[PDB]
């Protein structure tokens, strides 16, 4: 939503520490998606659970590939995030 600060890219569970790239720095990588209804060249918004859903987008995130399923609910999609809209 409007409270987004950054994105978590790594977690050390032993120390319970999450490494985060701030929203001011652009990123290109795989992120969790709400479902498999996302195609290439689609505007994506972060939901309340921190998952990317297909589109009032405060940030500009565009999907590079389609949703790929690994587990029953794990959906990984390659996305590039490059700041905030206006």
């Amino acid at each position: 939503g409007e409270d987004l600060y950054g994105i978590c890219i790594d977690i050390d569970e032993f120390s319970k520490t999450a490494t985060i790239v701030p929203i001011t720095n652009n990123f290109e990588g795989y992120l969790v998606a709400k479902d498999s209804t996302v195609k290439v060249k689609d505007k994506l918004i972060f939901n309340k659970d921190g998952a990317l859903e297909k589109v009032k987008a405060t940030i500009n995130a565009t999907a590079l590939t389609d949703a790929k399923q690994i587990s029953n609910e794990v959906y990984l999609v390659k996305v590039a995030v490059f700041g905030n809209k206006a």
Binding site: N25, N26, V40, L64, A80, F82, G83, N84, K85, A86
Partner: protein
């Protein structure tokens, strides 16, 4: 073309040191930090010294950058390699200060990128640090500092 392909007829006079930077061959920015994030992308057309946008094909080939702006602005091209067709792009998140193509304007004016990657007077993106300088009949450049997107 960043580098004038036509050969000069005379040797230049390397005696003066003033007003020797207002050339289209100048690549990069006036003030450059070693902590600036720099990317390269396939070049679609000639986006040199212009705002660029990401375009996706049919999926057979990867994404590329073409000169553009508006809501689709992705970055600013500050350099280009003609042999490899690669455009050096600074993301809109990173801030840039240098000479950019201007639509054919005074210091303190707020500038936004147009559909063709050309700066024009008014969301604002940059502020003009000087006046328009004419290099060719339709070529105008301006020193501008880009600080992202803000309404």
């Amino acid at each position: 073309m960043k580098n004038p392909q036509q050969d000069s007829g005379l040797l230049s006079n390397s005696i003066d040191f003033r007003d020797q930077n207002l050339i289209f061959s100048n690549s990069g920015g006036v003030c450059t930090s070693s902590k600036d994030k720099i990317e390269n992308y396939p070049a679609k057309g000639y986006p040199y010294k212009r705002g660029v946008k990401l375009s996706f094909g049919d999926g057979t080939t990867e994404l590329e950058v073409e000169a553009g702006g508006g809501d689709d602005l992705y970055g600013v091209c500050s350099d280009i390699d003609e042999f490899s067709g690669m455009a050096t792009v600074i993301p809109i998140t990173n801030n840039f200060t240098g000479y950019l193509t201007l639509k054919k304007v005074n210091p303190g004016d707020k500038l936004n990128f147009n559909q063709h990657g050309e700066l024009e007077k008014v969301s604002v993106n940059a502020i003009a640090l000087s006046k328009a300088h004419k290099l060719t009949e339709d070529l105008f450049i301006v020193l501008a500092s880009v600080f992202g997107n803000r309404a």
